[PDB]
């Protein structure tokens, strides 16, 4: 079925920002974690923090 | 996301 | 100023046929591509079909081929979609774009697009409603009022205050459907306390596939 | 065909801030990706070209970037005004297609909405059929619980809400809730209530008439 | 305009069409001569609109 996986992106400066992605559970999460991927390029390494069974991430960026 | 004629935008949720 | 308008959209029944133009200015189709694209809640934007108006080589989406034609009338600036043949999900804005213009490839202007309902549902006409402003619809010495547009069917309507002279603290809500299969939407506005009873309000609704124009002014209700 | 995928489908971020998209096609495209905006009642208007050039007009915190199949569209600086859908879109075969957009919100500071609420017009009564109206004005954020009440009785069913899109002056929201019933069901109870439910509000607002009340 | 003699057998055929309503027939006749280049497409979908109609 159709999930939604809702990330709170948290960047070195201590500003957030929110994102959602869907689709199956495997496919929402591919996606959440190749975003996490990109933005790492630019804002630095990143850690994710899974809870609510995966459907919700909390995702930090080094800096 | 899906869209309405009404707004012509995406209505998530 | 290049400019496309289209024309045409309107309820149709399943199986129905309509035709949609496109009306361009400020540039030559011939020098460009003509695109139909259409957007849906069902599948988004979505590519119709597109002419090189100079030699009329033609491509067409395969879910419409055979039952959509595209065309144009370069003596007119116009490009045209035949639309027969249609079916439900054929529901959409359908927007005429052009590509290659000034030697920009992608869709560089786009119409404001003209919206096609195949439904079996017959023509209503709104009642528009007033929300007049009362003690219950102010605090902070501004005051709330609006009109409610009920029971029309197809789309669109338009609302405008004071013949658009009033647009600040406008807001005027998505259109619902109601169980009924109508439509239904309000809009209200909010104004100064002390301007109620001095100041004109009048909410202009128009629903052309109905030819149903009401110019409705709301005030506070007499006790 | 060629598929184009959007992420993420929603992005919520502050004014100011620097926001990214993302859009990966399902084969080479080369770069003939463009990135279309659609603001609220609005067309889509060509922001980007060719995947990183910008078209004539658009702002220069606007910027596209490819990697192989992978495409991206940044805003350096995030504005009231980039409220707004994103698409891509791919020219390189035919059909040309769009990915499934990406909405852009605005986060702000939390604001509690001003509650109003209609009775039916008299006008309508004539008829058979009584609208009541409760409006939520300018709040933030859009997550808002409203229950109407008949003579206390909690009411299901029978009622619809309709919410704009973020207001371009100050990034809020507003709602309507209306509640349906036959002119006689109206006439037969007194009092008429919306309970709003907000996190701007320290605990829920009730807002009613009684019917016949001037 | 003018028609070689595989439109116009396209056109004798739609006219023909016996489950077709007026306007169905015209908007499909408009698409041959719309886009010549589409007529067995055309044609095809004309068929199979006449055909449900039955
Ligand atoms: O004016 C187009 C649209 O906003 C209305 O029809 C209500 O949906």
């Known amino acids: 079925s159709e999930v939604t996986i809702k990330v709170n992106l948290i960047f070195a400066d201590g500003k957030i920002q929110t994102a959602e992605f869907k689709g199956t559970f495997e496919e929402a999460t591919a996606e959440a974690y190749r975003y996490a991927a990109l933005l790492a390029k630019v804002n630095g390494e990143y850690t994710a923090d899974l809870e609510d069974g995966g459907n919700h991430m909390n995702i930090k960026f080094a800096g | 996301c899906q869209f309405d004629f009404s707004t012509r935008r995406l209505r998530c949720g | 100023e290049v400019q496309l308008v289209e024309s045409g959209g309107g309820l149709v029944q399943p199986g129905g046929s309509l035709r949609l133009s496109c009306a361009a200015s400020?540039?030559?189709?011939?020098?460009?591509?003509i695109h139909w694209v259409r957007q849906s809640p069902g599948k988004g934007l979505e590519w119709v079909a597109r002419?090189?108006?100079?030699?009329?080589?033609?491509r067409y989406a395969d879910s419409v081929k055979g039952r959509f034609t595209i065309s144009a009338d370069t003596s007119k600036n116009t490009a045209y979609l035949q639309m027969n043949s249609l079916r439900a999900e054929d529901t959409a804005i359908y927007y005429c774009?052009?590509?290659?213009?000034?030697?920009?490839?992608?869709?560089?202007?786009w119409g404001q697009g003209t919206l096609v309902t195949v439904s079996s549902a017959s023509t209503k006409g709104p009642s528009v409603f007033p929300l007049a402003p009362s003690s219950k619809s102010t605090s902070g010495g501004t005051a709330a009022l609006g009109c409610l547009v009920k029971d029309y069917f197809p789309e669109p309507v338009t609302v405008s205050w004071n013949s658009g002279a009033l647009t600040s603290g406008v807001h005027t809500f998505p259109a619902v459907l109601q169980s009924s299969g109508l439509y239904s939407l309000s809009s209200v506005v909010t104004v100064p306390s002390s301007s109620l009873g001095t100041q004109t309000y009048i909410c202009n609704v128009n629903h052309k596939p109905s030819n149903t124009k009401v110019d409705k002014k709301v005030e506070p209700k007499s006790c | 065909d060629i598929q184009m995928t959007q992420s993420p489908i929603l992005l919520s971020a502050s004014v100011g801030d620097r926001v990214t998209i993302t859009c990966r096609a399902s084969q080479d495209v080369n770069t003939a990706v463009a990135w279309y905006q659609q603001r609220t009642n609005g067309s889509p208007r060509l922001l980007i070209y060719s995947a990183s050039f910008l078209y004539s007009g658009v702002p220069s915190r606007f910027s596209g970037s490819r990697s192989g199949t992978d495409f991206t569209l940044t805003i350096s600086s995030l504005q009231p005004e980039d409220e707004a859908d994103y698409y891509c879109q791919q020219h390189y075969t035919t059909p040309p297609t769009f990915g499934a957009g990406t909405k852009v919100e605005i986060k702000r500071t939390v604001a509690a909405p001003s509650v109003f609420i209609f009775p039916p017009s008299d006008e309508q009564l004539k008829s058979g059929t009584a609208s009541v109206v409760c409006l939520l004005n300018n709040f933030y954020p859009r997550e808002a619980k409203v229950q109407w009440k008949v003579d206390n009785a909690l009411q299901s069913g029978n009622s619809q809400e309709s919410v704009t899109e973020q207001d371009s002056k100050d990034s809020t929201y507003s709602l309507s809730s209306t509640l349906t019933l036959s002119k006689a069901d109206y006439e037969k109870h007194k009092v008429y209530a919306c309970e709003v439910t907000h996190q701007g509000l320290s605990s829920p607002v009730t807002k009613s008439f009684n019917r016949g009340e001037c | 305009g003018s028609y070689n003699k595989d439109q116009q057998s396209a056109f004798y055929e739609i006219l023909n069409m016996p489950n077709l309503n007026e306007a169905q027939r015209n908007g499909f006749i408009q698409s041959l001569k719309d886009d010549p280049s589409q007529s067995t497409n055309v044609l095809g979908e004309a068929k199979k609109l006449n055909e449900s109609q039955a």
């Open positions: 400020g540039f030559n189709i011939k020098d460009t591509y």
């Open positions: 774009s052009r590509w290659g213009g000034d030697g920009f490839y992608a869709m560089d202007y």
């Open positions: 002419i090189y108006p100079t030699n009329g080589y033609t």
